[PDB]
Amino acid sequence: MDIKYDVVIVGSGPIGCTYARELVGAGYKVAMFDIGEIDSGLKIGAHKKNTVEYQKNIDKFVNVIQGQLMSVSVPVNTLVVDTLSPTSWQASTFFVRNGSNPEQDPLRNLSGQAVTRVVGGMSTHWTCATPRFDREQRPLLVKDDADADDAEWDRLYTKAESYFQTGTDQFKESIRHNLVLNKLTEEYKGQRDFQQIPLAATRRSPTFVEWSSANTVFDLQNRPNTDAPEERFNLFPAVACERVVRNALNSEIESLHIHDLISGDRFEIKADVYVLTAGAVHNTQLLVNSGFGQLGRPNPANPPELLPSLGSYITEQSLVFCQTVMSTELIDSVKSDMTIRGTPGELTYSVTYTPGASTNKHPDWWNEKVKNHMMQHQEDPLPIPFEDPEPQVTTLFQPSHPWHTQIHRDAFSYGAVQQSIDSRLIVDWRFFGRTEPKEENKLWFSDKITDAYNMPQPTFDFRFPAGRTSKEAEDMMTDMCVMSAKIGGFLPGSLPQFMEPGLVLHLGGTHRMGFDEKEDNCCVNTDSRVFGFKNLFLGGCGNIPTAYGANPTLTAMSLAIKSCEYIKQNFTPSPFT
Amino acid sequence: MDIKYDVVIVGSGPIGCTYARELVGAGYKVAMFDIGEIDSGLKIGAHKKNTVEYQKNIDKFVNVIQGQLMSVSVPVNTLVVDTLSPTSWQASTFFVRNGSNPEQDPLRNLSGQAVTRVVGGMSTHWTCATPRFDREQRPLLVKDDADADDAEWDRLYTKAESYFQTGTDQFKESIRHNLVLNKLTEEYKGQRDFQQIPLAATRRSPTFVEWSSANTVFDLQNRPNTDAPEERFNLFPAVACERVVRNALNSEIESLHIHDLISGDRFEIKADVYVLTAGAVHNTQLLVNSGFGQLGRPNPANPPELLPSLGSYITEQSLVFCQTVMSTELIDSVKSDMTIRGTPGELTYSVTYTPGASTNKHPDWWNEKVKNHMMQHQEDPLPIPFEDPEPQVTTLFQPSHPWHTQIHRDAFSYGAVQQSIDSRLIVDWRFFGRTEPKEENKLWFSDKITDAYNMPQPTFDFRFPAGRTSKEAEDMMTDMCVMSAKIGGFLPGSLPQFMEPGLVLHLGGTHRMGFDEKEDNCCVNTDSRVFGFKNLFLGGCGNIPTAYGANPTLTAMSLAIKSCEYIKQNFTPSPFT
Amino acid sequence: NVIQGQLMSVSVPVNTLVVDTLSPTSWQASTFFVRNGSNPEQDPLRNLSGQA
Amino acid sequence: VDWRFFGRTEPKEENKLWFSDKITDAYNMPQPTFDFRFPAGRTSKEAEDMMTDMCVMSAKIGGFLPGSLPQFMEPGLVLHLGGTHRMGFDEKEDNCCVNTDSRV
Ligand SMILES: *Cc1cc2c(cc1C)nc1c(=O)[nH]c(=O)nc-1n2C[C@H](O)[C@H](O)[C@H](O)COP(=O)(O)OP(=O)(O)OC[C@H]1O[C@@H](n2cnc3c(N)ncnc32)[C@H](O)[C@@H]1O
Ligand SMILES: *Cc1cc2c(cc1C)nc1c(=O)[nH]c(=O)nc-1n2C[C@H](O)[C@H](O)[C@H](O)COP(=O)(O)OP(=O)(O)OC[C@H]1O[C@@H](n2cnc3c(N)ncnc32)[C@H](O)[C@@H]1O
């Protein structure tokens, strides 16, 4: 292991991989460190649901997700257990137990917020939804020129869509998808538009979708190698990056202090450029542990020397959720073009349609699928083929409905009573609200309590702001109740509800971007460079300073691409030696 | 891809890897197929709990286990959901839904039986307990010579323990471990012996234990390689092995038919030797798909041509479980040697002991750990150090207590109310009973219903036998209640209970061993060779024909070692040319 | 049910259960205040919670 | 079959029923408050021995019904509260409130 690199990247999630793809491919000698380890098969950092076993039983994948989410801040537990035996040891107080954080006010938390420490970060389990932000959700890249701003965003998004292999066509011939899409299109004719959720994925077969991940962006293989003989890249897993060392003038980073978790050794690693892509919480922790912002409980009478906005203006989306069970009317519509003769299971049972007839309400391919299912499976009471893919429907955020929507299926933990309902009938509804950035909403770090890696313990001070955020969040729940009813009634056990704050994991604004440090209350400029520092960049959702409803990864990636362009103009790659 | 080898092995679990280690090492050209894929990191087939992240947060590992256990047979669901909206499509019958098996009687099932399809099989997540069977639980290898039989078992188990890196010392300096060990030792003085559970694991540091797996046994890297330039081995993941082809005389296997799940291609693989190590359920399924035993619901009027005992005499252990919260008496005993002056948090707080003093209850190393925890963490009300390892205690099966015992901790999902209890206080209790082999207890395969891989669907017909099995099961429950009370009272929410049948996953006897096919109602001989067939061997817990309570893997491995000795004496490795 | 309808708990400590899935528009407490006949004198770990 | 085993609790001065001077109940009376723990020593040992005895004795009749596994009940759910105004021969010597005629 060398002492000296051109570029060091902290974190191997999709944003770290965006920096790696750009900088490795432009000839820089790059090292990337991740506190977590390789565990996605031979494709390093790839999507864990791309195994044949998970494509066959998607519902088991929820356990993979839960297995790699570690709660950020867990308040001291105050549950009374008063049925212990009189011989068991019993507390006299609610003391600090089981990794809980005594700094945490349980009523001002993001209890759902969690982090993932594996190579490839959260992109080894994510849902892969990559919509663009419209103007109202999107940070400015060009001031006082809307057309140049639009064109810069379109350029960046288009490259990012390339890196993720985003597409809107992978579910085009699913009967359920089209059944839902067409009904909502009709119901909202001239009011709202519906389309497929943009998904980072490529269909390989009618029963296999290769979901994208960090690996799609950059394969994380050491270079040079055979396919890439001129490139230079080393990945170091199980390495905790602990701090960047500031020079006395606060104008440059001099090294990156690391702790090898296998060997136990500590090093100082030196590079021309330091990139932090450790996620929205862990970028902030690393910065704070390096003397940026303020350690300990916020004190507005003792302002921090550096980046006073760091860890303020934090945003997290409101999320509402329910599931539905498809209406009788919709289910009967699936077989509207069929002529049915006889009795199921008998010899003279016949299901037929006339292909191409003008009276047919469905296309030939749909009718063929339905006829074959009904004919080959006469014991089954539903017209939807067993292997029909799930719906993947959205109407994107607009000013008259300012929430993102997903009307679809992902991995779900059904209760035994719910497993009673045929899976083909079930549709998930998830509406995501935007949250106004407010100075009082903070992520801070204890000066006494430490986490499992002996770093200052993250603590939230968060409430959904009064005013627009709150009114919109409740209007959003109503909208889901109204819209979902057009498809079917709620599934018992999955009734309309707000999710635990932060369970969405779309945390933003912890190290937010803007044009001017003071005027825009921010930490990085539009090249993602830390103000004042020549050689320190941050990537990820923590850069996004706006109120957004849509899934933010694609936007973070777009910013990271722009960041790499600055880097490419301002730093010279070492010569191949 | 070659289609010709000396030895082909179906399954990459620890039993498949026992054959690979032996036969690759003896110079055979070996191929191994697994229907599952590589996903344990760069160490192929290794234990998934070996990451730093799981060493720090062990309770999250329960999710990893659940994500790779697929239920074998789920009966048709009859739960009534009668609060759907009137508009939702609603069933008139409890029709076949959601992969359920209409052949399965819900009251004669092993509902908790599940399989894992991943490289390394279940040894990627297992608890690593590897006790030997005493005579009463163990199949005979030598008839009418108890001493020779003991000597042969000792030789085999010794080699098996070396392969797994079994030890009884990895937890010797845990305070919690010794606290429990010494108390049970005292309480049962003269009546029962206690020791550490024998574990397949190597301690690397005070906070890291490297758990063994299939990888420990055999590293599963393609050979030849730098480290083994004269060996020959190829692993082929995502390949469903479907049938072995019998010759007309039923004396030899002629090929293995396989299905590549990625490409969709089918091949006939040729070998001199065919080894089936697909697990107790799937070995049986592959054999039945190949014309052994009987397909469909058992029909005694229509005897199977081959291996009529295949799928009969199946055994599964009864399992009782509770948790306890350590007694005040035991907790106070942890600090019995301490002198405490003043009160915690203050300046004059002192905790001291006298090293080597003859009136001390505890060794110096224990007193020093207690002393330092209490002095450095004066806010904490317990004398047990935060990183103190868990107990790993057993009293092994004996005639006067015919069940295996584990008094320990492994992966567990605590309810929010239980998370209220400090984890240092909690001990898990699991006692495993032996189940008599009975002809009527059967694993059979449907001739109409198929599973997720289009293979005949497994169906159980099982009840715990009346008589000794049942009486001993209830006596075991009582023994757990009596013995756990000596350590502490039950933890609310983990009260003494039988676990769902088969959730233990120690299924045996599906393709059982004996001396004589007819007289011993069995499928393989003591070399694990299928009767009548020169070149077909079965490995795994399915071979074990006895009633056993101890964890069976180490025993199955020992049988596979003996099987390899036969193969090495009867088959010649091809010339490495 | 007859029994439960005429058993009134003697001393119920202040409730500290966290409900954090209220809608943002709903009135939300800042503290665990004295609510619903709870007794702030009561140490929840030194109670007879079942006494009625 | 239901199994209920009831243990005896040593009377200890520190175990108290008292009444708030500020909080009031539904009848506007001083709010009762407990300060109670099962005493260490004999009470606690017997309680746990009692649990074990129920596990051993019940097994002779049948195994446990799932959902009604052996458990201690919430303290006081039993409603056999005693000693709040206790009898004895001598007020000071026997730490008591009424005599053997139940007279205060
Ligand atoms: C979990 C989740 C997330 C998710 C989702 C569904 C689930 C269940 N669905 C999404 C969706 O459909 N659309 C979308 O845009 N995002 C979705 N997500 C969130 C998404 O996965 C994240 O936004 C994205 O992965 C963030 O990428 P980024 O690269 O910034 O961060 P990361 O993936 O968390 O990776 C961070 C890496 O850093 C390592 N780390 C952390 N601390 C350190 C230190 N100190 N030293 C070295 N490395 C560190 C972590 O191990 C991690 O690998
Ligand atoms: C899950 C589990 C298991 C377990 C345990 C705790 C848990 C939660 N604790 C144990 C303990 O402490 N002590 C012990 O002895 N065992 C414990 N176990 C059970 C143990 O893991 C199993 O007994 C053991 O792994 C069995 O090994 P074996 O090699 O015989 O079988 P396997 O691990 O199931 O691997 C089978 C492989 O075969 C592949 N397969 C299945 N079907 C096919 C087909 N048709 N074609 C090709 N390959 C096939 C599977 O994918 C699997 O990988």
mmCIF file with all atom_site columns, C-alpha atoms in Angstrom, chain A residues 98, chain B residues 59 176 180 321-326 331 382 384 390-391 407-410 412 414 417-429 487 489 491 494:
data_model
loop_
_atom_site.group_PDB
_atom_site.id
_atom_site.type_symbol
_atom_site.label_atom_id
_atom_site.label_alt_id
_atom_site.label_comp_id
_atom_site.label_asym_id
_atom_site.label_entity_id
_atom_site.label_seq_id
_atom_site.pdbx_PDB_ins_code
_atom_site.Cartn_x
_atom_site.Cartn_y
_atom_site.Cartn_z
_atom_site.occupancy
_atom_site.B_iso_or_equiv
_atom_site.pdbx_formal_charge
_atom_site.auth_seq_id
_atom_site.auth_comp_id
_atom_site.auth_asym_id
_atom_site.auth_atom_id
_atom_site.pdbx_PDB_model_num
ATOM 1  C CA . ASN A 1 98  ? -27.409 -1.225  24.134 1.00 0.00 ? 98  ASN A CA 1
ATOM 2  C CA . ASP B 1 59  ? -28.258 -8.719  16.181 1.00 0.00 ? 59  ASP B CA 1
ATOM 3  C CA . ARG B 1 176 ? -20.221 -14.029 31.206 1.00 0.00 ? 176 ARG B CA 1
ATOM 4  C CA . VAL B 1 180 ? -22.639 -19.265 33.709 1.00 0.00 ? 180 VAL B CA 1
ATOM 5  C CA . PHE B 1 321 ? -36.060 -22.154 23.561 1.00 0.00 ? 321 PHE B CA 1
ATOM 6  C CA . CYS B 1 322 ? -36.157 -19.376 26.144 1.00 0.00 ? 322 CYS B CA 1
ATOM 7  C CA . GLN B 1 323 ? -34.053 -16.403 27.214 1.00 0.00 ? 323 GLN B CA 1
ATOM 8  C CA . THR B 1 324 ? -33.151 -15.406 30.750 1.00 0.00 ? 324 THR B CA 1
ATOM 9  C CA . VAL B 1 325 ? -32.116 -12.179 32.505 1.00 0.00 ? 325 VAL B CA 1
ATOM 10 C CA . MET B 1 326 ? -29.142 -12.767 34.795 1.00 0.00 ? 326 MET B CA 1
ATOM 11 C CA . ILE B 1 331 ? -24.368 -10.160 38.868 1.00 0.00 ? 331 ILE B CA 1
ATOM 12 C CA . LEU B 1 382 ? -23.182 -3.364  35.790 1.00 0.00 ? 382 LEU B CA 1
ATOM 13 C CA . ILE B 1 384 ? -19.501 -6.694  33.223 1.00 0.00 ? 384 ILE B CA 1
ATOM 14 C CA . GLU B 1 390 ? -21.055 -14.016 25.176 1.00 0.00 ? 390 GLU B CA 1
ATOM 15 C CA . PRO B 1 391 ? -21.389 -17.394 26.996 1.00 0.00 ? 391 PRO B CA 1
ATOM 16 C CA . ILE B 1 407 ? -26.586 -21.879 26.694 1.00 0.00 ? 407 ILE B CA 1
ATOM 17 C CA . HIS B 1 408 ? -25.233 -19.019 24.747 1.00 0.00 ? 408 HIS B CA 1
ATOM 18 C CA . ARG B 1 409 ? -26.029 -16.112 22.464 1.00 0.00 ? 409 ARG B CA 1
ATOM 19 C CA . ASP B 1 410 ? -26.504 -16.061 18.807 1.00 0.00 ? 410 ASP B CA 1
ATOM 20 C CA . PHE B 1 412 ? -31.649 -12.568 17.718 1.00 0.00 ? 412 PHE B CA 1
ATOM 21 C CA . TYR B 1 414 ? -35.382 -8.263  20.011 1.00 0.00 ? 414 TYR B CA 1
ATOM 22 C CA . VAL B 1 417 ? -39.694 -3.925  24.853 1.00 0.00 ? 417 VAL B CA 1
ATOM 23 C CA . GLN B 1 418 ? -36.933 -6.553  25.179 1.00 0.00 ? 418 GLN B CA 1
ATOM 24 C CA . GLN B 1 419 ? -34.318 -3.991  23.824 1.00 0.00 ? 419 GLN B CA 1
ATOM 25 C CA . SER B 1 420 ? -35.057 -2.370  27.084 1.00 0.00 ? 420 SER B CA 1
ATOM 26 C CA . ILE B 1 421 ? -32.972 -5.058  28.802 1.00 0.00 ? 421 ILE B CA 1
ATOM 27 C CA . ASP B 1 422 ? -29.233 -4.631  28.867 1.00 0.00 ? 422 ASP B CA 1
ATOM 28 C CA . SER B 1 423 ? -27.778 -7.250  26.457 1.00 0.00 ? 423 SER B CA 1
ATOM 29 C CA . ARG B 1 424 ? -25.075 -8.258  29.024 1.00 0.00 ? 424 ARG B CA 1
ATOM 30 C CA . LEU B 1 425 ? -27.818 -9.789  31.209 1.00 0.00 ? 425 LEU B CA 1
ATOM 31 C CA . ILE B 1 426 ? -29.365 -11.993 28.515 1.00 0.00 ? 426 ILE B CA 1
ATOM 32 C CA . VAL B 1 427 ? -28.616 -15.685 27.871 1.00 0.00 ? 427 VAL B CA 1
ATOM 33 C CA . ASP B 1 428 ? -30.277 -17.877 25.233 1.00 0.00 ? 428 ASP B CA 1
ATOM 34 C CA . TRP B 1 429 ? -31.247 -21.455 26.070 1.00 0.00 ? 429 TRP B CA 1
ATOM 35 C CA . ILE B 1 487 ? -29.047 -18.498 36.115 1.00 0.00 ? 487 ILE B CA 1
ATOM 36 C CA . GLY B 1 489 ? -35.735 -15.710 35.427 1.00 0.00 ? 489 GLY B CA 1
ATOM 37 C CA . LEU B 1 491 ? -37.070 -12.734 29.728 1.00 0.00 ? 491 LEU B CA 1
ATOM 38 C CA . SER B 1 494 ? -38.930 -15.104 25.179 1.00 0.00 ? 494 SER B CA 1
#
